[PDB]
Amino acid sequence: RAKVAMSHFEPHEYIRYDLLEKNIDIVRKRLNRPLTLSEKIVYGHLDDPANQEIERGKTYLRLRPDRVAMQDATAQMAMLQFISSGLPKVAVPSTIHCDHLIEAQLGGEKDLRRAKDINQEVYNFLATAGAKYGVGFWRPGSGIIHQIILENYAYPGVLLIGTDSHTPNGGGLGGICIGVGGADAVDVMAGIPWELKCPKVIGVKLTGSLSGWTSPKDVILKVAGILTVKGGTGAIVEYHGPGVDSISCTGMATICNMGAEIGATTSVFPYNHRMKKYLSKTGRADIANLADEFKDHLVPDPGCHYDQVIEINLSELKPHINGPFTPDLAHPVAEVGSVAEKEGWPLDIRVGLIGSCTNSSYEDMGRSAAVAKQALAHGLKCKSQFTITPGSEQIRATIERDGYAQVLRDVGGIVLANACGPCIGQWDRKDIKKGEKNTIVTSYNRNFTGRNDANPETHAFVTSPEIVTALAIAGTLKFNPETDFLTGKDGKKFKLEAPDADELPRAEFDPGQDTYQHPPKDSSGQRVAVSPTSQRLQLLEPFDKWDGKDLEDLQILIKVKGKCTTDHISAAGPWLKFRGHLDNISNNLLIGAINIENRKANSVRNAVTQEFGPVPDTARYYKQHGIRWVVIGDENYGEGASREHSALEPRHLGGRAIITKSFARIHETNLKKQGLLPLTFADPADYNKIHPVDKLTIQGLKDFAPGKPLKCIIKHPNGTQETILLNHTFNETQIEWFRAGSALNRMKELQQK
Ligand code: SF4
Numbered sequence: 201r202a203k204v205a206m207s208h209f210e211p212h213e214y215i216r217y218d219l220l221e222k223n224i225d226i227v228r229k230r231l232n233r234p235l236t237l238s239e240k241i242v243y244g245h246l247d248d249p250a251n252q253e254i255e256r257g258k259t260y261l262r263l264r265p266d267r268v269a270m271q272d273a274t275a276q277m278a279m280l281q282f283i284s285s286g287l288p289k290v291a292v293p294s295t296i297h298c299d300h301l302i303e304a305q306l307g308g309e310k311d312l313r314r315a316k317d318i319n320q321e322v323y324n325f326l327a328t329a330g331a332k333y334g335v336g337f338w339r340p341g342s343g344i345i346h347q348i349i350l351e352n353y354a355y356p357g358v359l360l361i362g363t364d365s366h367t368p369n370g371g372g373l374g375g376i377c378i379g380v381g382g383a384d385a386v387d388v389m390a391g392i393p394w395e396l397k398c399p400k401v402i403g404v405k406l407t408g409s410l411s412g413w414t415s416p417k418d419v420i421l422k423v424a425g426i427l428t429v430k431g432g433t434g435a436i437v438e439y440h441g442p443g444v445d446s447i448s449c450t451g452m453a454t455i456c457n458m459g460a461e462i463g464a465t466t467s468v469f470p471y472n473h474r475m476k477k478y479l480s481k482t483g484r485a486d487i488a489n490l491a492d493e494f495k496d497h498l499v500p501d502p503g504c505h506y507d508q509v510i511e512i513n514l515s516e517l518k519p520h521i522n523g524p525f526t527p528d529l530a531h532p533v534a535e536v537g538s539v540a541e542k543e544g545w546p547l548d549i550r551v552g553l554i555g556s557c558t559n560s561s562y563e564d565m566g567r568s569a570a571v572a573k574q575a576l577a578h579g580l581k582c583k584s585q586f587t588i589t590p591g592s593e594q595i596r597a598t599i600e601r602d603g604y605a606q607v608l609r610d611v612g613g614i615v616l617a618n619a620c621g622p623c624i625g626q627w628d629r630k631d632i633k634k635g636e637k638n639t640i641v642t643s644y645n646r647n648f649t650g651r652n653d654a655n656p657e658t659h660a661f662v663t664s665p666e667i668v669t670a671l672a673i674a675g676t677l678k679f680n681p682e683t684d685f686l687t688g689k690d691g692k693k694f695k696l697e698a699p700d701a702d703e704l705p706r707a708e709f710d711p712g713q714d715t716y717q718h719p720p721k722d723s724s725g726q727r728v729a730v731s732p733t734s735q736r737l738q739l740l741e742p743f744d745k746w747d748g749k750d751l752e753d754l755q756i757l758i759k760v761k762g763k764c765t766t767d768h769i770s771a772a773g774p775w776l777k778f779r780g781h782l783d784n785i786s787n788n789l790l791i792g793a794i795n796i797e798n799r800k801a802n803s804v805r806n807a808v809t810q811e812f813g814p815v816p817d818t819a820r821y822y823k824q825h826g827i828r829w830v831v832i833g834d835e836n837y838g839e840g841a842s843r844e845h846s847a848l849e850p851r852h853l854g855g856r857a858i859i860t861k862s863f864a865r866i867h868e869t870n871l872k873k874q875g876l877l878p879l880t881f882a883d884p885a886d887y888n889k890i891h892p893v894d895k896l897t898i899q900g901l902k903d904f905a906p907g908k909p910l911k912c913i914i915k916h917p918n919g920t921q922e923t924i925l926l927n928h929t930f931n932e933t934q935i936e937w938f939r940a941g942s943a944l945n946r947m948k949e950l951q952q953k
């Protein structure tokens with residue numbers, strides 16, 4: 201038995217490939233078929249491999265993740281619910297990463313120093329909560345959670361859960377990394393089996409090879425166009441084929457990462473020599489050697505069946521740019537000029553933003569600087585404003601030394617801190633007035649409405665960072681780097697050649713500024729105090745328990761039309777300063793959702809006063825008057841970010857049930873965790889039989905059972921009524937979260953009482 205540590209920070213915690221193999225063998229003895237790669241790693245992590253019922257797309261798997269990671273905008277509510285379980289330390293290796301509260305304003309350390317003084321209370325809280333419960337802490341400036349995870353923590357066959365959507369990024373290193381809400385991470389840190397609905401598996405076969413301007417990003421921008429934002433729901437995306445071996449480890453992380461934008465449970469690549477070179481370049485040669493020895497369990501079984509198969513010829517794939525308000529509106533960079541002209545999107549690119557998490561590696565920085573260096577050899581600088589986020593302090597230190605940062609700086613770039621920044625709206629913008637219509641190209645992944653700067657006329661197009669650079673040098677959406685014009689002030693030769701770059705540093709990486717903090721061995725006398733008067737941090741008052749009765753005469757707060765992401769339910773940006781305080785953050789509840797009645801964001805009819813106004817105020821009026829309510833939603837309600845606040849905030853403001861045509865995975869788990877009832881129309885046309893005025897009775901809660909539909913009476917103002925049926929995906933574990941008022945109350949009644 202090998203004793204290879206999980207990371208450089210937990211030398212006493214070994215990789216368990218013998219347990220994985222042990223459990224894969226038990227499960228294929230029961231299933232008697234080839235297993236996909238994701239099936240190998242997921243079923244190899246089952247708590248009961250001998251007795252787990254296993255069926256893709258319908259069974260709930262009780263899993264034992266190897267580690268947990270949180271970022272600081274979702275770590276706050278996850279550790280208040282861990283505090284509340286009153287466990288003295290966490291059960292598996294866990295980390296907090298301080299990357300979401302650093303606002304981009306001046307660049308680099310002006311901004312970082314600013315964020316340390318502005319978010320001192322929260323960073324203190326998380327640092328002393330981590331020292332006490334045994335959670336590793338990555339300080340402000342360390343880097344974006346996924347980038348530190350890929351560098352330090354992801355390895356082949358790991359099962360990692362993270363309180364973030366883009367945790368799937370770690371699949372570029374052959375692990376299964378799945379985003380969850382804080383209350384799931386609390387389960388695994390507390391020692392509870394993590395339950396996951398058995399994924400269906402999409403195979404993406406890659407043939408050929410990536411060439412010239414076409415980069416990793418374009419493979420997932422293509423797949424997202426192909427499959428749409430809803431197409432990966434309840435499935436893990438598995439890349440296979442001849443062309444996989446043409447992709448660097450960090451470009452495999454890029455493809456796995458944006459898979460979140462099709463709603464996939466996660467995405468993964470098979471262990472290969474590009475993962476082995478990346479493990480060795482990051483000081484984890486021993487993990488690559490161990491994985492080689494278990495490679496059979498870290499690739500798919502020959503002949504495994506994918507439920508859906510898509511083919512992408514890498515060699516004929518050419519550059520993409522997606523948007524403007526959904527990540528699945530895919531355009532080749534060549535036709536994006538002509539189609540923006542046609543559709544009424546600005547061709548002027550105000551700001552080009554490279555980096556942030558999907559695309560912030562040393563290869564992304566080398567390819568961006570290779571474009572920028574050419575512009576510079578012709579005495580050119582950017583016509584658009586340009587920002588660069590390094591993915592981690594290691595990448596910042598290594599590209600500084602290898603000179604990429606000075607080239608990016610010299611074409612007019614501002615290197616921002618190693619933090620999300622612009623990506624979740626931690627950006628103090630300035631170049632446009634409020635409501636100005638503008639374009640911005642970014643190498644991020646999401647381009648939801650007003651996500652970046654809190655302005656809706658902002659058309660955000662996502663693409664590769666080398667395309668963001670060249671298009672920032674050009675200033676317009678009608679420049680296609682592959683064919684077109686350059687001048688310089690020398691007057692000469694027009695064309696930007698294909699940005700060649702170094703995959704990894706040819707010397708060793710430079711680590712930089714010292715950013716990690718170990719939990720002390722004996723943490724006796726770590727008080728983690730939360731001020732009772734703090735406006736940033738507040739303890740969670742347990743939600744009420746279910747009174748045993750049905751839900752009669754529910755008022756509709758809002759019937760939502762169309763696309764309703766977690767950014768519509770609970771916006772980020774200025775709202776991240778309250779992510780530790782549920783009553784203050786509940787003031788953004790569904791302010792961005794579109795009301796079907798008037799098609800306005802944030803004005804719904806108050807049913808008592810008949811005055812239209814803000815959705816949070818109306819919810820608070822109903823709660824204070826004892827009027828219970830529901831949201832009626834359309835398709836894939838709760839798409840996007842994993843923030844469990846989307847679920848905590850309707851519960852806190854008096855909500856009882858959300859009834860939709862369908863839900864995104866993670867938000868539906870969170871609504872069940874907080875004691876709400878996520879329900880779906882058995883017939884989605886029934887959405888049209890429910891009008892804003894109608895009162896709803898959900899009946900037969902007293903017989904709430906797995907697989908049994910609930911009925912709903914739609915009581916029309918005029919005395920007619922009609923009964924429809926509502927489906928749910930609750931199992932008995934989850935029904936007992938409902939009955940107890942939340943999964944936290946259910947844990948608390950199990951701890952004696
Ligand atoms: S998507 Fe943006 S806010 Fe979410 S983790 Fe990545 S960089 Fe940070």
Ligand SMILES: [O]
Nearest residue numbers: 364365366841
């Ligand atoms: O994210």
